[PDB]
Design a protein around this ligand. Structure first.
Ligand SMILES: CC(C)(C)CNc1ncc(C(N)=O)c(N)n1
Ligand SMILES: CC(C)(C)CNc1ncc(C(N)=O)c(N)n1
Lengths: 237, 237
């Protein structure tokens, strides 16, 4: 099953970062992921191709001009056909987490609207946007990096693109000793079950130490409860 | 005051997305922000320029090979001189928010290590990395988009790049009526103080409705307490 993502952006060439490189680049080349861009600048009619406009009420910044942006959105919606969810990315949106990625990955078509300047007219959010999403509680110069982050995250769910609430365990590769630090012997034991339990215990320990609030949201298995208790006992010596 | 950011990445051309476009592109052209990239592939010695390696303990994925990555990091550190903080980006790191952006923006030099595959050897985190940071609780195919997100966020603090804990207020531009929706008359009143209070009240209302936990962390001013009370009264009709 493939995924189609329409993007509205003043800087469509930024999207080469995901369409030309790495796992996502392969997904695009293999037609597993399609990314199509529309630029509001192409929908302007004045000589200077104006894409910003002044905010009612004054203020230091500018907003995206409504007409070119609205026309670009409508063109993207026509290209998508029916069933495409239109998303605006901003810090005022629902904060993205891996559960939200999983939800968004259920869509076969998405349209991502990338804001620049101080943002977009509130009435376009009311009339054109289905959902507002944020990649995190911080402020950027534009919505393109958030859009690409979202695309990369959801692309991992497309069948063929790739070859539990806890933080990842530590990983080791060659050499066996690096600046005096050795690989945990269990990882060289060849005992698959002991290795699985070590990695799970490490993930539980790391989540407890670094992000204890994430543990509150989990219903730990019996095995996970035991390994977490073991890790906490070792921490308390 | 300018900022220098060294980047370690297998896909340095992805960084054109921030260095060639928009506000960050201007910052680079004007020498306010410098982004310098080193690619571990350039530090390999085998015929096929191998940059991945197998994890001790088995598993489905690969890790970044230690030697090319270590050598790239050391070269970046030599180029940076003293005082450069080395950051690894992963979901196991401290979660980025605007307060964390402000902290990171105090550095004149940063080195950002971008992981690919299943990540990097834990001992390199111990021996080479000063701080681990996450852009959010979700999983991506590589650390490049997180690195670019971080760069964009901190670049906004560099003097000359640009022309309070609450969500932003709604913004409006032309036309006065859009699909039957009118601009709030206060924004056309020309009354600067009434406009300021309306925007602040809207920010308080939106934060309360969408992200009430963010309000708990704020020490509201008298004015903010009053406007929030007004907005909550209007919500309860
Ligand atoms: C100002 C404008 C909203 C137009 C773009 N800046 C921006 N900053 C942050 C995010 C985010 N955290 O998701 C985003 N989507 N966009
Ligand atoms: C797997 C590997 C860690 C190498 C890169 N994937 C990744 N996914 C997410 C983030 C983040 N949330 O910050 C990140 N920095 N990197």
């Amino acid at each position: 099953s493939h995924m189609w993502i329409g993007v509205i952006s003043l800087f469509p060439e930024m999207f080469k970062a995901i369409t030309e490189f790495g796992v996502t680049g392969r997904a695009v080349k293999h037609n597993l992921l399609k990314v199509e861009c529309w630029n509001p600048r192409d929908f302007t009619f004045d000589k200077h191709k104006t894409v910003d406009d002044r905010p009612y009420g004054g203020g230091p910044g500018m907003l995206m001009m409504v007409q070119p942006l609205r026309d670009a959105i409508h063109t993207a919606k026509a290209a998508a056909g029916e069933g495409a969810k239109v998303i605006y990315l901003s810090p005022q949106g629902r904060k993205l987490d891996q559960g939200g990625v999983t939800e968004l990955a259920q869509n076969q078509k998405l349209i991502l609207v990338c804001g620049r300047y101080e943002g977009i007219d509130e009435r376009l959010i009311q009339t054109e946007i289905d959902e507002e999403w944020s990649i995190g509680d911080y402020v950027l110069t534009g919505g393109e990096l958030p859009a690409m982050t979202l695309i990369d995250a959801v692309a991992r769910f497309i069948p063929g693109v790739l070859g539990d609430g806890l933080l990842d365990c530590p990983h080791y590769t060659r050499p066996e000793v690096l600046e005096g630090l050795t690989v945990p012997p269990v990882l060289m034991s060849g005992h698959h079950e002991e290795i699985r339990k070590w990695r799970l215990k490490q993930s539980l320990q790391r989540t407890w130490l670094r992000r204890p609030e994430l543990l509150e949201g989990l219903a730990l298995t019996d095995e996970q409860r035991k390994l977490l208790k073991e890790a906490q006992a070792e921490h308390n010596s």
